[PDB]
Design a protein around this nucleic acid. Sequence first.
RNA 1: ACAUUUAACUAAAACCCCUACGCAUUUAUAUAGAGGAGACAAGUAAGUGUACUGGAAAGUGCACUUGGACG
RNA 2: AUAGGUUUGGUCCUAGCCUUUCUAUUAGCUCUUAGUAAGAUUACACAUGCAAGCAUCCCCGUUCCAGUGAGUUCACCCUCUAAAUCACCACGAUCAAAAGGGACAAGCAUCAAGCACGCAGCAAUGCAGCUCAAAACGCUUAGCCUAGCCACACCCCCACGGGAAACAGCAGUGAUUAACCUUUAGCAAUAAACGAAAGUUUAACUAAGCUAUACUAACCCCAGGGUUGGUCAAUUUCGUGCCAGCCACCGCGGUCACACGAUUAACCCAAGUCAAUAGAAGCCGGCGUAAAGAGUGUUUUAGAUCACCAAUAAAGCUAAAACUCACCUGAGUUGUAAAAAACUCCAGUUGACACAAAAUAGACUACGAAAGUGGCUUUAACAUAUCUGAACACACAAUAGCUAAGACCCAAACUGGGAUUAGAUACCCCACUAUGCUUAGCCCUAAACCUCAACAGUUAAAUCAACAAAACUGCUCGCCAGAACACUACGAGCCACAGCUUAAAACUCAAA
Lengths: 108, 164
Amino acid sequence: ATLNQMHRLGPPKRPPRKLGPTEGRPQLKGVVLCTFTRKPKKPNSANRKCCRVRLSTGREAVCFIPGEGHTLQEHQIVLVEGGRTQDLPGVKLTVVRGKYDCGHVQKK
Amino acid sequence: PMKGRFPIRRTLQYLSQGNVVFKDSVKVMTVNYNTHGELGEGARKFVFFNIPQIQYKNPWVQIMMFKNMTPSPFLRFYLDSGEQVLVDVETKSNKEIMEHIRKILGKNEETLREEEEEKKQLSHPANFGPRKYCLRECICEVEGQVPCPSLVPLPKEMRGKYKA
RNA sequence: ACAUUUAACUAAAACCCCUACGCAUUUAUAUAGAGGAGACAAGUAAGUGUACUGGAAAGUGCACUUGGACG
RNA sequence: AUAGGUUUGGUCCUAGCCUUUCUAUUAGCUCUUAGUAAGAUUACACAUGCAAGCAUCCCCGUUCCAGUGAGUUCACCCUCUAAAUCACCACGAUCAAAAGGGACAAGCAUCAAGCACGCAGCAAUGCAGCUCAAAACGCUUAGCCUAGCCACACCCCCACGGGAAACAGCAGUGAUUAACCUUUAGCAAUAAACGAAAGUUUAACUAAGCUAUACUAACCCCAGGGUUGGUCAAUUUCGUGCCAGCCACCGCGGUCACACGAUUAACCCAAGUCAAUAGAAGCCGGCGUAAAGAGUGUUUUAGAUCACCAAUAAAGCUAAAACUCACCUGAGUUGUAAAAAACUCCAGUUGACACAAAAUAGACUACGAAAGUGGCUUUAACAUAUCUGAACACACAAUAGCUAAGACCCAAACUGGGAUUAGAUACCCCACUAUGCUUAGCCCUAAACCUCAACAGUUAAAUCAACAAAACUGCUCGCCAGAACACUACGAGCCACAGCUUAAAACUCAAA
Ligand code: FES
Ligand SMILES: [K+]
Ligand SMILES: [K+]
Ligand SMILES: [K+]
Ligand SMILES: [K+]
Ligand SMILES: [K+]
Ligand SMILES: [K+]
Ligand SMILES: [K+]
Ligand SMILES: [Mg+2]
Ligand SMILES: [Mg+2]
Ligand SMILES: [Mg+2]
Ligand SMILES: [Mg+2]
Ligand SMILES: [Mg+2]
Ligand SMILES: [Mg+2]
Ligand SMILES: [Mg+2]
Ligand SMILES: [Mg+2]
Ligand SMILES: [Mg+2]
Ligand SMILES: [Mg+2]
Ligand SMILES: [Mg+2]
Ligand SMILES: [Mg+2]
Ligand SMILES: [Mg+2]
Ligand SMILES: [Mg+2]
Ligand SMILES: [Mg+2]
Ligand SMILES: [Mg+2]
Ligand SMILES: [Mg+2]
Ligand SMILES: [Mg+2]
Ligand SMILES: [Mg+2]
Ligand SMILES: [Mg+2]
Ligand SMILES: [Mg+2]
Ligand SMILES: [Mg+2]
Ligand SMILES: [Mg+2]
Ligand SMILES: [Mg+2]
Ligand SMILES: [Mg+2]
Ligand SMILES: [Mg+2]
Ligand SMILES: [Mg+2]
């Protein structure tokens, strides 16, 4: 572009940053509605432990439960953070271990 | 690289290199010049190189250009009193035009140094305040004075917790 | 729409208006129903535009291109 | 950025995503001392206690301080000039309202027109004007330009009035959020209010309390967190076997797993560590083939320095070849790899005979802005002695298509018949429509391409990623910033109504 065109257009106008599943918040509180498992997309194979949660904002979302063995049931309270599960498409929230009902992974 | 011929013109150093600071009487500067004709060559250069500097040093003076309206180039300055100053610039180089306008309507170096000294007084070195305005924030930064408790804890006798 | 009284051998008292807003107007939410995109999951050269046929897959007509072939 | 990882069988280029750095909040785990700084998520609702007195009565103050960030170009400069302080006799300084002039945040032009937004006159009244693609009008977002400033003080902008009964003062509480400080003391200092003054009052403030949020300094015994496949510093044994599980990106896990779990050892930081979130840091680069020169030309406000042959409109005209008609002659003609259908008012010679198309020339490379233009004659006729200049303004735009009428040789979507085929809703043969033609209107799309934007200039440099078409420079307009969603949705405009122009977002991916 020429100098006249650059002056006409002005400084670049950067689009606003997209808000993620947590909507720009570190963590979110949620109530577990149901627990289930999902299968990875296929370079891999497993049964990933997941749960649907109604967040404090009212939106329902699918979350992954990290670690070996969880004791989450319906109506329980959990704290969910960001971070995509690379194997599960559409799962962009992760349950925080050791907060509210979701306890730490049992040793061994 | 930077766009356009002579990109140095679009740097703050070049813009600040000008030496023409108009007196407060000047309000408007019209520049009538011709795009073609050897006798106007300097005037064209005067438009190309020195008008940005003049405007940079004189932000409130209205500078306006006119092209191929008269057979010869000339400058006209309008003063606050209503007087008009006509400067014929045909056959003159751009440096000559700068020197002429500086001589006839430019503040001399004495006035500029006086203004700088006046600006100096506003920033009193003894005043204490934010670094944006003062050299030092607190007297505790002065050696020999009681230092800040943030860096050196005060003796227990000087603290209210152990005076109460 | 609406209006100047008392008082005055020192000087004072008195003063107060009625109308709007709705079957108007703006945007948004919920809801019947309909439809998309994504994820998962599994011989007639090639095209562009346009038109018809066909339930589709595709075929054909007209003009244009080589980003094909012609030892 | 001193950069690095990641597309491919491989190389180069382009391009996104991520890594390494520094902050703040929150979460997990852990946490010794001292000093200092800082300290609800919520303009939601608030129990309780304080936060404004002074003073010989009048007045003065409670319009300040303190709080919050809901709304939002009232903050800044100049002119003029109130109130206030001091001169107080004013001359005037200081300070600073109202009024006038100027300046002043971000995103969206799919918000493009606003609809009275001006001027002149003493008025009467007259003129029809004013703003706007250099962004008016409009919607959305946000306290700001921080010695501080602006705005608000429960709501109806305001507060006569109404809803109704107010902590966005300090301490504190309920609800809510990922977000969580004591219902301390004193007016000893400074500041403010009052007083003539000694002085009095103050949840301003000062001195304390709580909190790893940060900085500084320590520590007599006292260390935790994360990581160890590459980017990127650092794994020994086992357990498990595409399961359990792990990853910021690339990826690992199928019996020898440095990538999962335990364990050993090691690496980084350290009273911290670092998981999540949000910031800090960006177009002077490009447009033949990667995104981008959007079919063609003109001009406006502006910017720049480069100041005869094949055009197109009219009118006329016709040399071949068709079709149709007539005589004469023959019984077959057509169809093809081969056949069947079809015709037999068929076929051959001769003669007459278009509103269709324009061999050879043309092995030419011309005219026109492009689209296009190639039979003959004639009349009009091919802008501009600077250049650039529009998706929308003004004009045009192959083929196809839609309205009206007309012409109809040939060709031919479609539609029938014949044949083939497992089937043929195609290919082959026959017939025949819309359409190709003229007239008057529309429609406005193409691989509308030399896939090279217009003007001016250079052949010197390493010519130069590659290929295409040798490499560049100046200047201007247009356009482009990962893929797909998407020649799409919505909005707007249109003689278009299954249409054209402009043209997104959500979800998804690490590529394309
Ligand atoms: S800043 Fe001066 S004593 Fe702290
Ligand atoms: K695998
Ligand atoms: K008083
Ligand atoms: K605010
Ligand atoms: K208000
Ligand atoms: K005091
Ligand atoms: K093993
Ligand atoms: K072409
Ligand atoms: Mg076609
Ligand atoms: Mg890269
Ligand atoms: Mg590879
Ligand atoms: Mg922590
Ligand atoms: Mg006064
Ligand atoms: Mg004012
Ligand atoms: Mg525009
Ligand atoms: Mg829209
Ligand atoms: Mg706000
Ligand atoms: Mg309140
Ligand atoms: Mg109010
Ligand atoms: Mg409070
Ligand atoms: Mg906090
Ligand atoms: Mg008290
Ligand atoms: Mg304190
Ligand atoms: Mg391991
Ligand atoms: Mg392209
Ligand atoms: Mg082109
Ligand atoms: Mg032009
Ligand atoms: Mg435009
Ligand atoms: Mg057309
Ligand atoms: Mg037609
Ligand atoms: Mg063409
Ligand atoms: Mg152009
Ligand atoms: Mg253009
Ligand atoms: Mg894209
Ligand atoms: Mg469309």
